[PDB]
């Protein structure tokens, strides 16, 4: 059972990193980012599966999640579908302080909170998630 899930999640991690690199190059080559949109359905289906959350946290897929959420050097934000799906997945999983330390997603969350091109609903969700993640540190 679960060794296999870790291998599949690692393969998904490699695919996500490769798709992000390809989309960044395509934007640098004057082409729209399409690979992330192509991979979005499979990532959504994997993330929606609750029992795989433990394996996701054991493979630290949140690093690739943050890589996708990281704005590209052209100062262009990711597609709204990607942001919405990743926010929903982040809400749907029990993120603890150790996972945040491994991934460092707090920096991107703070950037999303401070930014204004971000959707106001995403702004409120980012504030809520940041407060929830600061909750265990102070008590």
């Amino acid at each position: 059972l679960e060794q296999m899930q870790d291998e599949l999640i690692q393969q998904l991690k490699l695919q996500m990193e490769e798709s992000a690199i390809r989309d960044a190059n395509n934007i640098e080559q004057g082409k729209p980012a399409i690979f992330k949109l192509k991979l979005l359905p499979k990532v959504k289906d994997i993330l929606l599966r609750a029992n795989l959350a433990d394996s996701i946290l054991d493979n630290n897929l949140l690093a690739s999640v943050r890589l996708w959420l990281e704005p590209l050097p052209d100062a262009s934000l990711p597609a709204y579908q990607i942001q919405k799906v990743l926010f929903d997945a982040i809400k749907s999983l029990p993120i603890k302080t150790s996972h945040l330390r491994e991934s460092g997603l707090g920096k991107v969350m703070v950037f999303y909170q401070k930014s204004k091109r971000v959707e106001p609903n995403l702004k409120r969700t980012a504030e809520k998630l940041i407060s929830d993640w600061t909750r265990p540190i102070m008590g």
Binding site: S131, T134, M138, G139
Partner: peptide, 13 residues
Amino acid sequence: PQRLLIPTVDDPG
């Protein structure tokens, strides 16, 4: 500061 003053569990209800 302003951020540090956010409430905790032991703060008054």
